[PDB]
Amino acid sequence: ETPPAGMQYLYGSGEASALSLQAYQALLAHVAAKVKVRPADSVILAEGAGLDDPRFVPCGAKPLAAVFDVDETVMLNIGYEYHAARTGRGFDTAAWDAWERTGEAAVAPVPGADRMVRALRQMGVTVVFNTNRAAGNAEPTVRAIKAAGLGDAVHGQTLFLSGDDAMGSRKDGRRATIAARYCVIAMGGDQLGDFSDLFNGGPSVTARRAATMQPAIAQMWGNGWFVLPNPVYGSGLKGGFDEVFPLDKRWAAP
Amino acid sequence: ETPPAGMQYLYGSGEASALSLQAYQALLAHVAAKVKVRPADSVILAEGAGLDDPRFVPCGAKPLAAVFDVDETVMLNIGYEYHAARTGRGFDTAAWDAWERTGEAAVAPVPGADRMVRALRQMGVTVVFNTNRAAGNAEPTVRAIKAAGLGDAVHGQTLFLSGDDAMGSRKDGRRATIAARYCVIAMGGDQLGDFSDLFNGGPSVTARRAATMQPAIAQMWGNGWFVLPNPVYGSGLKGGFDEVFPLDKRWAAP
Numbered sequence: 001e002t003p004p005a006g007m008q009y010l011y012g013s014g015e016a017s018a019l020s021l022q023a024y025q026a027l028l029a030h031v032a033a034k035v036k037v038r039p040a041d042s043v044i045l046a047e048g049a050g051l052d053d054p055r056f057v058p059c060g061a062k063p064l065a066a067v068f069d070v071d072e073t074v075m076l077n078i079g080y081e082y083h084a085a086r087t088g089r090g091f092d093t094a095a096w097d098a099w100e101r102t103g104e105a106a107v108a109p110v111p112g113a114d115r116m117v118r119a120l121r122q123m124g125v126t127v128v129f130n131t132n133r134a135a136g137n138a139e140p141t142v143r144a145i146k147a148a149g150l151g152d153a154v155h156g157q158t159l160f161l162s163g164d165d166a167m168g169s170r171k172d173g174r175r176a177t178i179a180a181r182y183c184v185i186a187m188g189g190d191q192l193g194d195f196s197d198l199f200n201g202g203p204s205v206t207a208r209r210a211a212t213m214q215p216a217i218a219q220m221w222g223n224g225w226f227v228l229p230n231p232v233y234g235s236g237l238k239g240g241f242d243e244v245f246p247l248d249k250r251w252a253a254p
Numbered sequence: 255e256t257p258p259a260g261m262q263y264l265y266g267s268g269e270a271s272a273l274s275l276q277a278y279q280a281l282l283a284h285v286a287a288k289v290k291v292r293p294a295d296s297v298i299l300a301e302g303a304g305l306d307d308p309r310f311v312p313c314g315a316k317p318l319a320a321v322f323d324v325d326e327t328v329m330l331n332i333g334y335e336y337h338a339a340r341t342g343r344g345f346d347t348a349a350w351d352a353w354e355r356t357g358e359a360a361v362a363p364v365p366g367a368d369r370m371v372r373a374l375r376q377m378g379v380t381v382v383f384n385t386n387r388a389a390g391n392a393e394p395t396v397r398a399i400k401a402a403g404l405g406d407a408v409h410g411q412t413l414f415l416s417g418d419d420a421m422g423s424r425k426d427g428r429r430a431t432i433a434a435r436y437c438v439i440a441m442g443g444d445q446l447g448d449f450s451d452l453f454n455g456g457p458s459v460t461a462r463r464a465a466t467m468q469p470a471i472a473q474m475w476g477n478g479w480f481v482l483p484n485p486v487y488g489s490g491l492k493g494g495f496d497e498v499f500p501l502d503k504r505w506a507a508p
């Protein structure tokens with residue numbers, strides 16, 4: 001038995017770690033420039049701004065910050081994905097809850113994430129985590145973040161979790177709270193909902209992919225919005241044949 | 255039937271296209287800086303330089319260039335992966351040969367690759383492809399590259415293929431030929447062998463991942479060496495449980 005190909009890729013391969021180091025190298029270069037020349041706009045969309053016409057929360061004079069998704073963006077949930085590969089019960093919500101409470105010693109940093117977070121703090125940039133881990137598991141999540149070498153997160157100040165408001169897995173509310181306190185100059189994530197809820201809750205697989213190429217959205221990638229790979233679970237693992245293989249690009253062997 | 259999760263991710267998801275646009279945004283910013291301030295070293299390793307002590311071919315006064323892997327770096331082989339998902343015969347070498355000869359109309363650019371290649375040429379940077387597609391299929395490959403919106407490749411000048419020397423799938427020989435003519439200021443790929451053959455032909459799954467974090471190699475990612483995702487086939491899809499899930503990071507649900 002080999003693990004699922006996506007987990008071989010993400011957790012086993014040098015290809016995936018090189019991909020992750022690349023994201024954080026670009027992020028650190030971007031943050032350094034914005035520390036020297038403060039932008040007018042932050043990288044967090046204004047409330048009511050749609051994907052057909054993106055607009056952003058002003059940077060103002062607010063203290064500089066970077067916002068990170070947690071799972072598979074700064075921290076690899078190796079123990080849980082081991083359980084999923086061994087048992088085939090990755091979709092078990094009670095197992096994931098147990099993992100939030102007890103997985104502390106089975107996480108690793110995403111390659112380059114521990115180094116990136118130290119550099120941001122040396123630069124005077126506040127590191128803020130916005131994750132859909134549950135509020136009631138804030139203390140074990142704090143411990144897992146620290147165990148992954150990512151420093152000290154504080155619930156309600158530099159850590160925001162699902163349940164901190166009544167929006168569920170929608171992260172726009174927490175993003176608005178963060179953007180009201182900080183000038184967020186970089187934001188990292190492995191899922192499109194780590195940048196805007198507008199990618200989810202409706203849009204199809206093909207619509208979401210097209211939305212990443214809307215010009216005002218496309219300009220963000222590697223330039224304020226920084227992406228980490230996740231072919232293992234979540235919103236990238238959707239679609240039938242007609243949405244994955246467009247019908248003008250099909251072919252049959254002899 | 256849904257396609258394999260890796261293909262959903264790579265070909266269907268907005269996550270994957272955002273990841274690819276990020277790589278090319280970082281590449282274009284890197285190339286622009288090196289066009290204004292020519293480096294002393296190119297991004298191609300010197301012959302005999304090992305992964306334990308990387309050294310590079312000098313840039314000199316040679317004309318500026320960028321080197322790209324083709325398959326799943328600048329061009330998506332949608333038709334072939336459709337065939338693999340439909341038939342389960344992705345590993346068929348005769349089917350892949352037929353695809354090299356007849357897949358011309360079933361390719362798409364990797365998101366951002368057509369735009370990136372146009373920008374590099376407007377900057378006066380020569381675009382060179384180094385691919386393990388076969389020399390005998392150079393003409394259909396030229397047509398597929400052009401069909402993907404990537405411009406005109408020329409065999410032996412800006413296109414180098416497997417069989418152009420007696421090294422097989424090893425690309426170091428072609429890299430040395432390119433580096434002798436150009437100052438290569440950026441190199442893109444989806445496989446570690448698109449940067450050095452020293453990652454392959456021996457090193458285990460865990461050894462190759464560690465090698466990407468050797469400091470002189472780690473400095474390259476997003477900073478001369480640019481990586482595109484491929485959780486669908488190739489050297490990232492290897493390893494048993496003990497190499498994917500390190501034994502200090504294991505966990506079992508209640």
Ligand SMILES: Nc1ncnc2c1ncn2[C@@H]1O[C@H](CO)[C@@H](O)[C@H]1O
Nearest residue numbers: 081084090091092093096232233234
């Ligand atoms: N391999 C996986 N398959 C399904 N869900 C996963 C996996 N890894 C983590 N999860 C998370 O576990 C929960 C239950 O599916 C969700 O929060 C989901 O994001």
Ligand SMILES: Nc1ncnc2c1ncn2[C@@H]1O[C@H](CO)[C@@H](O)[C@H]1O
Nearest residue numbers: 335338344345346347350486487488
């Ligand atoms: N899904 C796939 N599975 C296996 N090989 C593939 C796949 N897609 C492309 N290839 C290529 O097809 C050839 C036969 O395995 C190799 O050159 C390999 O790189």
Ligand SMILES: [Mg+2]
Nearest residue numbers: 069071072190
């Ligand atoms: Mg996440």
Ligand SMILES: [Mg+2]
Nearest residue numbers: 323325326444
């Ligand atoms: Mg390739």
